[model samples]
Target: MTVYVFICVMIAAVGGLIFGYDIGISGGVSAMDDFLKEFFPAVWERKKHVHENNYCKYDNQFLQLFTSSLYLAALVASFVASATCSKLGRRPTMQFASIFFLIGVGLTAGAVNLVMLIIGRLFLGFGVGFGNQAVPLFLSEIAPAQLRGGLNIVFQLMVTIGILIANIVNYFTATVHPYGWRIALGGAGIPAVILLFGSLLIIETPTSLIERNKNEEGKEALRKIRGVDDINDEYESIVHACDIASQVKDPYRKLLKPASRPPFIIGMLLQLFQQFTGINAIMFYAPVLFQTVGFGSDAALLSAVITGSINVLATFVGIYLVDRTGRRFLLLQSSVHMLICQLIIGIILAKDLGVTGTLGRPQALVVVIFVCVYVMGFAWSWGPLGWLIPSETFPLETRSAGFAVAVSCNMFFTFVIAQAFLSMLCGMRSGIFFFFSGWIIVMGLFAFFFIPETKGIAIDDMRESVWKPHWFWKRY
Candidate 1:
C-alpha cells in the first residue's frame, strides 16, 4: 500500500499546504505598513497611536472579520459537506473545494475593498470547510491500519511546511514592495491547482464506493488502494458495518443514542480542546503578536520566520512519534505541556504587558521559549490527533454525521478565538493566556478520563475501543 498511501497522503496533504499558505500570509499581510497604507488608510492614519508608529494600527474589529469569516463560512460549509459527501464521491467534492479556493485566492489578490476581501475569504472558507470534512475521511479510509496514525499526521506536517514556506515567501515579498502582500495572499492558488487536479485522478475510497452499492468498482478500488489482490476481509468488514447500520432509519438521530454518544463526545471535546488552546490566534497573526511584544517591523517578521521555522522542524518529530506513542498518552502529555507554556506566557505578560524594553532582552527571549514550547506540544499531540480522532471514531454508518459534528465544534471555536484574540490581547493583556491555560487544564482532565487510546485500532474496532463511561475505564 506504499504507493497507494503516498498518493493519498500527498494529495490530501497539499490541501493543508494551501491552508497554511493562507494562514501564514495573513500574519504578513495584516502587519504590513504598505499594505495598510494602500488598502486600509484609516488604519494607517491611526498608526501614530501604535508601537512608536512603526506598525499599522489595524482596526482589530475589522481585521478580525477577515480571519473569522473563513471559519464562520467553514463552519457552515463543513455541515454542508457532510450532507453532500455521501452523494458526491470524496475526490469530486475535494475538486469542488479546490476550485473555490482558487477563485478565492485570485479574487483576494485583486481586492480593493473590505467587501471584496471578505467575499474572497468566504470562498476560501467554503473550500476549507469542504476539505475539513473530506480530507481526513479520505486519509482514514485509504490508509492501512498500522500506518493510519502516522499517515494522518501528514496533514499537520504539510501544514507546518506550508506555514514555513509561506513565511519565507512573505519575508522575501515584504522586502520587494507594499503590494507584495497581494502575492502572499494569492500564492495559495498554485497548491490549490495541484489539489484540484490530483483529486480528479485518484480513485474513490473503497468504503464510500461500496456503501453506494458500487461493489465491483469498490472491490477493484480496494485491490488497487491496498496494492493487494485480496481485499475480501476488509471489504467484508465494511459491508458488515453498513449492513448493521442499514436497519436504522436515521443515523443522524441515532448518533444521540448511547452506543454512538461516547465517540461524539470524544470527538467534539477534542476539537474544543484543539481550538480553545489558541494555536490559530498565534498562527494567523504571529508577526503581529511579536510586534506587540516589542519586536520592530523587520525584527518581528524575522522572528516569525524563525518561529514558523522551528515549528516546521518540530512536526517531523511528531510524525515519527505518532505511531509509537499511543494517542491517549500523547494527548495527556501534550495538554499539560501546553498548559505550562501558557501559564508562563500569561504570568510574564501580566507582569509586563507594556514593555518599555528596559529589561527587553531577557523577557523577549523567555516569551519566545514559551511560545515555542506551546507550538511543539500542539504539533505532536492535538494538532494531528484532533483531526485523526474524529474521523476514525465514528461507526461507519454515521461517520459523516459524527465528523461533521466534530468539525462544527472545531470551526465554531475557531471563529470565536479568531474574533476574540485581538480584543482579548487589547483589553485583557496577558489575561488571555491565563484563560487559555485554564482550558488546557480542563482538556487534560478530559483526556485522562475520556479519549480512549485509538492508535493502531482498526477502523472497525474504533466504535467500541475509543470510549468509556462505565465499561470504558476497565479496558486498560
Candidate 2:
C-alpha cells in the first residue's frame, strides 16, 4: 500500500527539487566572483573597492532582476496552469513544467549575456508556476485523510533537499573559475529530467479522472492507489465532489462567492504572509546577505550551506509534527519563535553591524546562529505549510482555480520581495530585520484568529468537517 503512493509522491516531489535548486543556486551564483566579473562587471568593480557601502554593494537592479524575473513570470504562468490543470489534468501540466524547466536550464547554463539570463529565468519561472500549481494538488488528492499533511510535506522536504544540494554545488563550484556558475545553473536540469520521466510512470489522481468524466478509469485509479478494490465510500465521495464541481460554470468567478470566502482569504493570505516572513529574501540572497554582514565570499557560501542543511533537517520535524499536532499549532508556534528570532537579529545588527561597518567575528557568528534558528522556525512551519494548507483547504469545486490564485499570490509577492530586497537592504540597512519582524507579528495574529485546524479532515469533506464547524468560517 505504501509502495505505490510512496513512489508517486517521491517522483512528483521532484517538482520542488527543481524549484529549490533554482532558489538556492541563484543566490550563490550571483555572489560568485567569476559570474559577477562576466555579466555584472559594475557590481564586481564595486566589490573590489573598500569604500563601498556594505548594504549597497550588491544592490544593482539588473542583478535583482536576474533573481526576481522567474517569480514574476511564475505569477503569470500559474493562471495558465489553472486552466490546463483542470482541462488536460495535473499529470500533463507537470510534464510540461519539467520540459520548460529543462529548456531553461540549457539557455541559462550557456548564457553569453544578460538577455539570455533573463529569458532563461522566464522559462524557468513558467515551469515553476505549473509545477507549483500541480504537484501540491496531486499529492493532496492522492493522500489518505489521516496521512495527508505528512504525505503532502514530501514535496516541501524535496525542496529543502534541493536547496541543500544546490548550496553544496555552489560551494564546490565557487572554486572552478569561470565555468563554475554554468555548472551550478545547469545542475537544475537533473531534477527536471527525473520529473519528466517520473510523470510518465504515475497514474492520474482519481479525483482528476472523475472530474474529467473518466468514471470507470477513475474508480480503477482509486482502487490501484488505495491498494484495495473496496473503495466504495471514498470513490463515491470523489464522484459527489466532482458532480458539484461540474455545475460551476466558472470556478474563478465562483471564488468570489460568500461560501468560497474562507478558503480564498486563507489561501491568498497564507501565500502573501509566507513571503513577507522574509524567508525568500534570506534564501534568494543568502551568500550575498552573509557577505553584507562581513563574511568573505567563500565563508558566506559555507554559512549558506549550513543554513540549507538546517532547513532540510528542520522540515523533518514538520513532517513528524504536522499530523500529530494540527496545522494551527505549528503555524502559531513558529510565528512566535520566528518573531522573536527576527527581532533579536534586527537588534543585534542595529547595535553591532551598523550601516557602514562589518560585524566582528563573534557578532557575525551570533547572527548566523539567529538566522539558523529563524530558518528552523520557517522550515517546519511557514515553509512547507504555506503550500500544504492552501492545497488542502479548497472544496473540489474550486480547488484548481482557488489554488491557482494562491500560487499566483505566492509568485507575485515572491517577485516583489526578490526584486526589492537588495534595494531595501541598501535603503533600510539594519532596519530591514525590523521590517520583517513587524510582518511576523501580523502573521502570528492572523494565524491565531483566522486559520482553522485542518488535521485529519478528508479533502472532500472540508466544508463540513472544517468550515461549517469553525466559529468564524461557519458563516461562510
Candidate 3:
C-alpha cells in the first residue's frame, strides 16, 4: 500500500513539471529574436526597433495577451477540472489533461501563424487548469496525516525542478535561432506523454470511491494505499465524513453557509495573494526584469537561469522542513523576507545607483541578490503552502467545488500580473516592485490572523476545523 501510494503521488505530481515547463519555456523563447521574427511577426515587428528598451516583440496589452492567453484559457478550464473530477474521478481527469497538453504542444510546435500558436496554448492552458485543481486534491486525500504536508510539498518541488529544467533547455538553445525555439517549445509535451500512460496504472483514491458508495472498492483502494488489507477503521471514517458533507441540500449554496465560508475565503485569499505578491510576474519574465535592471542580453538570460536554480534548490528546503517546521511559520517568514526584498529592489532601482555608469556592477549585483531572496522566500513558503492550505481547508463534499473556485482565483490573478508586468515596468518603473511589496504585507497579516496549523491534522477531520473558522486556535 505504501509503495503504490508513493507511486501515485509521484505520478500525479508530474503534471506540475509540465505546468512549470510550459510556463518557464516562454521566458527563454521570448528572447529568441530570430524565431520571433519568423513565426510571430506581430510581436517581432513591434519589438524589432525598440531593442534594449523592449523585452521582445511583446509590449502593452499585446505583451499581456501573449503571456496570459494560455491562463485565460486556464481560467475557464479550472471549472472544467472541478466538474470532470466530480463526475469522472481524479485519475481519469489527469489522463485527460495530459492529452490536452500533448495536443497543445503539437499545435504550438507546428504553428506558422500567431493565432495557431495561441490556440495551441489554450489547449495547454486547459491542461494546466486540470492539473492545478486535481493534483493537490488527489495527494491530500491519499496521504496519511503525518506525511501529508511533506507529500503535498513534492508537487511544488516538481514545479521548481520543472522550471529549472526549462531554464536549462532555454539556456542551451539560446543560439539555436529559429527552429530551435520549436524544439524547446515542444519539450513540454514529453512529460505529458509519460503522464498519459502513467495515470493508467494507479488506482482511484479511497475517498472518491467511498463517496460514490463503492465501499468495497474503496476498501480495496485504501488497502493498497495503506499497505494493509483490512482498513476497517479507515473505511468507517471516510464514509462518516462523506455522509456529513452530503447532508447539505444545496450544493452551490452550501459553500457560502457559515460552516464553509472560512475555508473557502481563506483558500481564495491565499491563492489571490500568492499571485498578487508578484512571483509569477517575475517567474514569467525574469530575463526581462534582469534586462531592465541593467544586465546585457546574455547576462540577463544567465541570471534568469541562476534564479531558476535558486527556485529549485529552495523548494527542497520547503520539502525538508514543511512537516517539521510548520506551514504558517514558513508562510509568515516568507512574507516578511519577501516584502523586504521587494522594497529593496524598488529603492535600489529608484536611485539607479549603478545602472548608467561604467561601474554599473553594484546595481546588477543587488538585482541578483534581490531576485534570489524573493525566489527563496516564495519557493519556501507561498509556492507550496498556497496549494497545501486550500487542499486541507475544505470539507470533502465541497472540496472539488471550493478548490475549483480557488484555483480559478489563482489563474485569474496570474493573468492580471503576467499581463501587467511589462506594461507596469514601462509606466511604473521601480514602483512596480513597491506595488507588490505593499501586497506582501497584506499576505503576511492574513496568514498571522486567520490560517491555523495543520501539520499532523488528518484530512478526514478537516471538516471539523472548517465548521468554525478559528475553532482549533480557540479550543486548543
Candidate 4:
C-alpha cells in the first residue's frame, strides 16, 4: 500500500480508539469509590455491606442507565451520521464526531451533577455513532482489495489499544484523590483531538468524491492513494457504479428491494451476533464482574488490565490471519473456542459461587484464564470482522445508509446488554454465561450456512463476485 493511503486509514481509525476508550473507561470509573460517591452514593453505600449477595451488589438500574445511555444516544445519532456521511461526506462527518467528543470530554470532566455527566455521555455517544458510521466505510473505500482485511482490522486494533490504555489509566487513577474519575473520563479527549486535526490532513475516499459528482477530484484521490498515474480501469468501474447509484432517488428505500436483501441481511445479522457474543458485556463490566468473584478493588482492575492487554495483543493476531485464512475460518474457530470457555466459566460459577460466599482462589484464577482465552478468541475473529464485513458489503447506492443500519443494530444491542447485564447477573447468576453460549451456537451455524467468503473481492464488484455466486444469497 502507498504511504498516503496508510496515513489516511490510521487517522480515520483513531475513531475506533476513542470508541474503545469510552467502553473500557466507564466500567472502571463506575467501580471507583470516588466516582460512586459523587453520583451514585447508594451504590457506594451498598458496596460496604459484606453480607450483600455478590451477584447483586451493583444492580442499581440508574447506575446501569448511566452506562447504557451512551449507546441509546449512539443508536439515534447513527441515522444522523448516515445523512452527514452521504451528504457532507465521510471526512467532514468524522470531523464533526471529534468535535462532539471534545464537547463530551469537556462536560464530563467538569460534571457537577448526574445530569451534567449523563448529558456529556450522550454527546460522547453521538461522537461514537458518527465515527462508527464513517470510519469503517472510509477505510474500506480507501484500501486496495487485497489489503482491505488487514487495513480494516487496524480500526479494531486501535479499539483494543484504546481499551488497554483506558484500563491502564483507570488503574492508575483509581487511587487518586476525590476526582480521579474525571481524569479517567478526560483522557478520551486525546484521541478526539488527534482525529479532529487528522481528519483535516487526510483526503476523502475516491468513492465518496466520485459519488458526489466531483469526478476530477475523485480521480486525483484514486491516483494519490494508488501512488500510480495509471488508474483507468479502476476509475472506470467506480464511475460506472456512481452512475447507477445516482439513479436511485432514495438509497434507504433501495435497501428494501429484493436484489439488495442478501448484503443487507448479512450486514445486520453480523452486527447483531457480534454483540450477542457478549464481548461488550464482558468488556464493559469487567472490573465489576471481577469484583463479584471476591477480588478486592485493586485486583479486579488489574484483571481488567490483563484482559485488556490480551485483547490488544490478540487483535494483532487477527490482523495477521484475516486475509490469509479468510473471514469464515477465524469466525467459526473462535465460535467453538468462546462457547467452551463460556460453558466452563458458567459451570464453575454455578458450583463454586453461592448466594453468600466468594469463589475459591483456584476457581477464581481458572475463571480469569478462561476469560482471557475467550477474549483472545473474540479479538481475533468476531470483533474486527463484524465491522469489516458490513463496511465492505454494501454497494455505492446504499453504502452509507446500509452501514448506518448495521451501526445502529450494533449500538441498540449494545445498549440492551449494557442496560440489562447487571440485572441479568443478579437474577440469572451463572446462567448468564449459558445464555450467551446459546447465542454463540446460533451464530456459528449461521456463519457456516449463510455467509459467503468475501476474500479479495473489490468493493464495487460485491454484487457480482460475492453475492450472486453464493448458494443461498444468489436466490435474492
What are the lDDT scores of the predictions, listed in order?
Answer: 0.77, 0.84, 0.76, 0.85
Q: Of 1 and 3, which scores higher on lDDT?
A: 1
For residues 255-353, what per-residue lDDT tens digits would candidate 4 score against the true structure? 888766888999999888989888876688988988888888889999999999899889887788885888778888988999999999999999988
lDDT tens digits by residue: candidate 2, 1-476? 56658756777677777888988999899999999988999889988876357888888899999999999989999889888877888789888988889899999999997899899999999999988888767776777766655566777787788899999999999999969999999899888888888887777788888876657577777777777667887776776665664466656568888877888889889888999999986689989989878888799999999999889889987788775788899889988899888888788877777656788888898889999999999998988888888777876667767877877888899999999999999998777778998899999899998898887777668877887777788555
Better of 1 and 2 by TM-score: 2
Candidate with the larger lDDT of 2 and 3: 2
**Model 3: CA > 4 A from native:** 1-3, 39-58, 140-145, 206-227, 231-233, 241-249, 353-359, 395-397, 452-476
Q: Which stretches of candidate 4 lie over 4 Å from their true place?
A: 1-7, 140-145, 203-235, 395-397, 457-471, 474-476
Q: Could you give candidate 1's per-residue lDDT for residues 23-67 as a string of tens digits?
A: 777777777776777766776666545454222234368788877
RMSD in Å for model 3? 3.5
Candidate 3 accuracy as lDDT: 0.76
Which residue runs of candidate 1 sit more than 4 Å off their true CA positions? Answer: 1-6, 49-59, 211-213, 216-234, 244-249, 355-359, 454-476
Enumerate residue pairs that collide in model 2.
Answer: none
Name the lDDT value of residue 252 in candidate 2: 56
Assess every candidate by TM-score.
0.89, 0.91, 0.88, 0.91
Give me candidate 3's TM-score against the actual structure.
0.88
Q: Write down the worst ten-residue block by lDDT for model 1.
A: 50-59
